[PDB]
Every structure is written in structure tokens, then in C-alpha cells.
């Protein structure tokens, strides 16, 4: 039997109860600064704390507008709009929009999924309000920042067997769009994930304005002045696994890495990365995805990427994260450009590590001269110049199968060895490595 409520005030009591079936009636509901306080509706954060288990919540035709000023009403603390702590809950069809662009007093998360066996389905989320907004991570995304930040991220999947399905997540905020943290068997399925871009040249045009970047003479956290010629996302990862983190299940606090992530039939647009799971453990499986205009396509470290696609307008479609990457099996289509090329990385793929099986397919005939498949070598990546992030660049590749069903040139560096290469044409293959095999295939 479904209980229908017609106010946020009447909804909140159900979030503390088990085994309920609740529907918030179709309509527009607004949360403003005046709704936060001791005798106001929201006296604590997280605003919507789903503590019960085995419950279902129907938000069909519900527009929930949350004024970004609310992110400053809880002191110097984290503000989570929605957090699920219970188990076996289903939340469906909510349209949640941050109103305005006010930055959090500290930081914010739109949705946090702890517990186990929860599902959020059919949500439409628009994320706003963060600082600094306009630079990506150039001036710091963690500690020791050049410009101190007030990040605001989208969906954080933790817990066990938690599931995000058929959601639209649009970010205009400096933070991750979808991320996994201490999550065991998280699944992201059928989602559309979208940020927006800004060139480093446009940022550099702030010279002499007195902007925050102008004040630090554009000195990045990578140890050098912000280079021209790159296209950056104003968001962080599209789908990204955290290195560490904490989750809560049945009152147990758990610190662990993410393990066994699955990503299916997702479209990720204009984020710092399409799908990055290198920090996760266990079985990694990514299938049927489409990455458009991201700074990086797929970087899962190890596992399977299959029937996936990405364009190469702003960065490579594929990157091995470390030289210890092992067993990365990928079948990636290099898609037609979704916009004008602006790729300062000078690469469509950077390959290293050992025992990979990599296939690239494309119908592109006009190859920009700076674009190439690199096995080993010195990647001109925005964040790995001049010794920055040194473990993520200049590493060897050994015992790799590379099936190049593209017109893209291939550059095998001297650090490359035992690379088995097949390609449509071999004339545009430069081999400076050891015991590499290069063979021509017809089309």
C-alpha cells in the first residue's frame, strides 16, 4: 500500500522508518535558506537522510529545487543533500536542481549511497555552486592547493551492491560528477553524465584582470605555469573510483578501496575523464559506453573495456595509468569528433604496463598531425609535464597486443618491448623499441 504525502515536512518522518512505500505528490518543492534551522524543516545535514531499510520512494513529476545558499547554512561542515544509510531501498524519478551558484562554506555532495542493495533510478540531477569554478583542478583538487576550494560533487556510490540506473547527471560545479568510494560491487547503468569545458588559453587570458589565477601568475599545483593549448573540464571525473575512503553498512564503519565496479551503457560528456577505475580492485567491467569531449577516455588500470567508444577532440581515448598496469583488455572505437579538435596531449592513446590486449577501431580518414598511438614515451599530458605525477608518465610497455584498425599513426618508444602490432597500414608506424612485431592487415 502506498502512502502519498504533499509536503517535504510530511515526507521527512518516513525517512526514519523501515518497510515503507511512499510517494511525494507531483509538484514543485523549494528548499531555501529560510528552511534551515532549529525550528525550520531542515535542522541538520544531510537534508534527506534515508535511514530506513526495505523502503520505496516515488518522486515521479517531483521538482525539488534546492537553493545553493543552503550549502552555507550548516557552518564549516559538509552538506549532503541526500544520503542513504539503510539497505534495500529504491528511490525513483526525482528531478533535483541546485538553484544559483553559491559556493559551499566547506564542501557539498548531492547524493551519497551507503548501506547495501540500494538503487537510485531515473533521477535528473543538476549540480551547481562551488569554488573556484572556471579552472578545473589546475590550482588544486586536494590538500596543498594554490587556490583553496569549496568543491561540490554529484553522486558518490559507496556501500555494497549499490546501483545508479538511467539517471541524467548534469554538473556545472567543480567536483566529481559520478564517483565510487569504498564501494563493493557498485553498478552505474544507462546514465547520461555531462559537464562543460574551458580552454587553458581562455584561462590564461585572465592575465592582468586580478582573477584568482592571475594573482598566482597561473602557477599550477603541477609545478609549472598553466600551459596554453589544452581543453579542460570544469568538473572532475565523469565516473571515477576513489583510491580509499570510508563507507557505512549496518552501523559498521569500513575503510577500503572500491572493488568489482561495473559500468554499462553510459554516456559521459565534457568531464575530466569518461571512466577511470584504476584505483579500484577486483573485476572491472565497462561495456557499451560513449565518451564525448572528455580530457581522457578510459583508464581502468586492469580488466575489460568492450564495445565502448570515445572521441579524441580534447585528449586520448585510452591511457594506462601506471607502469604496473597489467591485463587491461580494451576494444575502443575512436568516434568522429563531437566538436572542433583542441587536443594538447598530442596523443589518442598512451600505452604501458604489461600483458594488455588492445584494439582500436575508427572510420576517421583525416588524422590531425599531432595525434598518434603511443606505446611508452613522454606523454605531453597537461598534468604530467616536467616530471609532474611521474608514475603516470614515461614508463615501459612489455608483452602487449595492439590491434590498430585505424588510420592513426603508432609510435613505439625505446622503452617498449615485445609489442605485437597489427595495423591497417604500417608505413606510419615508428618502431624504436625492442623485439616488437609489426604486421599489415587489410582494412
Author numbering: 1 to 443
Give the authors' words.
We show that the FdlA-NTD adopts a right-handed parallel β-helix fold, and possesses a substrate binding site composed of a long groove and a unique alkaline pocket. Our structural, biochemical, and enzymological analyses strongly suggest that FdlA-NTD utilizes catalytic residues different from other β-helix polysaccharide lyases, potentially representing a novel polysaccharide lyase family. Here, we report crystal structures and enzymological characterization of wild type (WT) and eight single mutants of the catalytic N-terminal domain (NTD) of FdlA, revealing its unique substrate binding pocket and identifying the key catalytic residues.
We first measured the enzymatic activity of 12 mutants and found that eight of them (D137A, K141A, H176A, F179A, E236A, R240A, Y242A, and Y242F) almost completely abolished their activities, H279A mutant retained approximately 65% of the activity compared with WT, while mutations of Asn243, Arg272, and Tyr322 to Ala only negligibly affect their activities. Similar to R240A, the mutant form F179A also exhibited a structural rearrangement around the active site, with a 3.8 Å shift of the Tyr242 side chain towards Ala179. Therefore, mutation of Phe179 and His176 possibly results in the dysfunction of Tyr242 and hence loss of the catalytic activity of FdlA-NTD. As it constitutes the catalytic acid, the hydroxyl group of the Tyr242 side chain is essential for the enzymatic activity, and its improper positioning may severely affect the catalysis of the enzyme. Circular dichroism (CD) spectra showed that all inactive mutants possess similar secondary structures to the wild-type protein, indicating that the loss of activity of these mutants is due to the residue mutations, but not protein conformational changes.
